[PDB]
Write a protein that binds this ligand. Sequence first.
Ligand SMILES: NC(=O)C1=CN([C@@H]2O[C@H](COP(=O)(O)OP(=O)(O)OC[C@H]3O[C@@H](n4cnc5c(N)ncnc54)[C@H](OP(=O)(O)O)[C@@H]3O)[C@@H](O)[C@H]2O)C=CC1
Ligand SMILES: NC(=O)C1=CN([C@@H]2O[C@H](COP(=O)(O)OP(=O)(O)OC[C@H]3O[C@@H](n4cnc5c(N)ncnc54)[C@H](OP(=O)(O)O)[C@@H]3O)[C@@H](O)[C@H]2O)C=CC1
Ligand SMILES: CC(=O)N(O)CC[C@@H](c1ccc(Cl)c(Cl)c1)P(=O)(O)O
Ligand SMILES: CC(=O)N(O)CC[C@@H](c1ccc(Cl)c(Cl)c1)P(=O)(O)O
Ligand SMILES: [Mn+2]
Ligand SMILES: [Mn+2]
Lengths: 379, 379
Amino acid sequence: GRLRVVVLGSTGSIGTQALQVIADNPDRFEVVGLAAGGAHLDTLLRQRAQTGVTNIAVADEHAAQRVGDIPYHGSDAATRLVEQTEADVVLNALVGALGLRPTLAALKTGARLALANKESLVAGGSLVLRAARPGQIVPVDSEHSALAQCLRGGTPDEVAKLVLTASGGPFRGWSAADLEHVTPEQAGAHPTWSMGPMNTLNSASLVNKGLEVIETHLLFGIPYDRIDVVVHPQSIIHSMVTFIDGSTIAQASPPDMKLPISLALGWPRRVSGAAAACDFHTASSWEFEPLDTDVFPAVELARQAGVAGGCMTAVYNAANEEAAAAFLAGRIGFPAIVGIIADVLHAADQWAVEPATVDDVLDAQRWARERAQRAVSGM
Amino acid sequence: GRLRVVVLGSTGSIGTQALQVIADNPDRFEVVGLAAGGAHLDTLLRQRAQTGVTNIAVADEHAAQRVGDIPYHGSDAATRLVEQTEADVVLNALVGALGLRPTLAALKTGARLALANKESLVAGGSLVLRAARPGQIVPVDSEHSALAQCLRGGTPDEVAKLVLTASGGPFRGWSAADLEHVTPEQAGAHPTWSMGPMNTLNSASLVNKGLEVIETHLLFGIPYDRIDVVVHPQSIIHSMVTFIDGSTIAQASPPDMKLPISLALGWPRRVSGAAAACDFHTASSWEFEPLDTDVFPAVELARQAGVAGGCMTAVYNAANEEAAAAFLAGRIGFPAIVGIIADVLHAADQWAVEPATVDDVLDAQRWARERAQRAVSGM
Ligand SMILES: NC(=O)C1=CN([C@@H]2O[C@H](COP(=O)(O)OP(=O)(O)OC[C@H]3O[C@@H](n4cnc5c(N)ncnc54)[C@H](OP(=O)(O)O)[C@@H]3O)[C@@H](O)[C@H]2O)C=CC1
Ligand SMILES: NC(=O)C1=CN([C@@H]2O[C@H](COP(=O)(O)OP(=O)(O)OC[C@H]3O[C@@H](n4cnc5c(N)ncnc54)[C@H](OP(=O)(O)O)[C@@H]3O)[C@@H](O)[C@H]2O)C=CC1
Ligand SMILES: CC(=O)N(O)CC[C@@H](c1ccc(Cl)c(Cl)c1)P(=O)(O)O
Ligand SMILES: CC(=O)N(O)CC[C@@H](c1ccc(Cl)c(Cl)c1)P(=O)(O)O
Ligand SMILES: [Mn+2]
Ligand SMILES: [Mn+2]
């Protein structure tokens, strides 16, 4: 019975929650592979001693060294683990477009792919899709896990709009003016639950949502002018679908990535007690309000990148990563993140071409990153 | 494919909206028979003129006398028309227990039953289930249509509970006291041109939700203690399905029965443009609050009555019918409606038996009214 799972980026936020669900359901899953950057050795050590898995991948050469006994090391350590470890599912919980190679390697083994690393799909684009077979990529991201469950009840020609909900980030309601005084402390702190750093910042910049709009077009095949976004502070409703008759179906639950993770891992069977359900034993209200595009153009920028397509989406992400890094380092301002992105994108003309090989994509991201530094150093 | 529809109760609210839907979607539907009571004979004859259907039935002979060329007339006219008409869908929009025979005749023809009539299920419980085959009955009630669509979110064995939403009525969140000086007009007991003061009252009394809770059990097989009710003022979400993993699927839409009516008619294919969808260009809110059962025991009784099965639900509804009348005639106070219902059910233990024939159900009701009328006059 048990499904054989490989966890990439097991030491991270998604990763550890994934091993909890696997630990709490030994009847459904078995851990057969682990991979990490190398920055959280003690975590990785305790993960090995607990799951009893030694088939491990560590990116950092020096780190893999002082730990000893690690079969795969170096930047390709994660991709090699995938190619040589038989599994049923590969949970890609790595962060960044760097996870693009493990994703392709995973699809190529034929195993299912629990995707969390959205950047590999955004950057991969059509390249990754050709690699995947119908329904091989199961979403872990909560908006997509939701859309999936909501679409279970219908056919595409009956779908009118896909409505993605966004928390609005912690600066929701502010003006372009106020935004300029934002500091790395305010865009990486969260009052009620936690995620990784990069994903936390993108949440504040609304670029994460932009990233999810593209992930949606790619995963579900719905055109960009039929994928909506709406701010929902509570983040209880995780996404909705509107059908041609006027009916809307939506997925809801108290925030907890454990939910979409256990579903992705157990696809197509739900996992009992994976998470807590909405409690109507006590009053509450679910609010909705439109996103302010003038103050947060991030999502419009994503759509534009998407419509143009090709490696244009990889540029979008490559640019963001460089500016977000420049931002947290204290080299540029917050409004500058989206700003630097429109700049890089306005010049990405030669990249509207679909990628023929990973290389075409590495080339586009390469270009984007530099053009992004040039724009940063331009300030 | 063009489905052939038989509309029972064509001059009513559900029936005229069904005809609007059919009129605006000829490519999908076609009317091949209409049935009314005779209270609005002129409207029925005009419908004959408009649609071109001569295959009509009127219950009232007196009324039928005023026309002379009606194929089916007299008690059982509607049942005869069903048995005599070839069709793909019979829409039962009849009111009261007299809608029970037509529902049964319909199921026997094997046609799809878009069931609106509440007594068919609430009164003829086991008689209707044993008679219908799986998936033959598609609900027209907004709450049930919602649950039908949300259940596509998982298998029957993954459903942890069904959550029906109620508007709460006019005395929503009121205190047990407040309900003392409650008068008829307050409970919206107005003489509207179309539907009687009962709905508005059952809705203000939560007895409607109770009946809906009973119909839910019989339609989806979910044990009563796993059927919750929650107050939702806006009435946008119509019901939700919570699964064993914590995910909850909800169905939202602006209030318009044409939506659930167009579902039942062409299930499972959605009808383009049936109703208007939820627009999120506008900042709205969906509020939820629990129901104080100690102030509205209405729903708790429905569950007790339905757990007892047999004709006990018929008792529940008949007992309410009279009690409601007593309140509408000042004979009793508001809190007294559910209280009297409480009494009548506590003494109907004999009606726990499964009804064998339609007469078994009518008797239970004839009985419950008597007993309820007694508790009013205090005899
Ligand atoms: N956290 C959340 O709530 C959500 C996350 N996601 C997505 O899931 C993905 C991961 O999110 P998250 O867990 O929060 O990010 P984290 O920062 O918490 O973890 C990132 C993981 O990747 C590993 N890693 C970093 N670099 C490399 C490398 N070069 N080679 C191999 N492994 C590496 C890290 O190992 P190390 O121990 O050395 O750091 C770490 O385990 C992201 O793409 C994100 O967008 C999506 C929706 C929700
Ligand atoms: N209205 C709503 O929003 C909802 C209604 N429902 C249920 O759907 C059912 C019908 O609702 P609704 O349309 O509003 O009720 P209506 O009073 O508006 O219409 C009842 C219809 O049945 C006809 N009728 C009455 N008696 C007979 C008879 N003996 N033989 C043949 N036809 C007869 C009437 O004709 P005539 O008037 O000429 O006598 C009329 O066309 C009910 O059981 C109700 O509870 C469920 C959910 C929502
Ligand atoms: C959990 C998840 O899926 N995310 O994308 C984290 C970021 C998003 C977010 C932030 C906070 C919460 Cl509680 C939730 Cl459910 C989602 P956002 O809507 O701000 O972009
Ligand atoms: C012809 C005209 O102007 N009318 O207002 C007809 C209204 C008629 C009417 C009244 C109420 C209903 Cl619900 C229906 Cl279907 C039809 P009536 O039964 O009163 O004749
Ligand atoms: Mn997300
Ligand atoms: Mn209803």
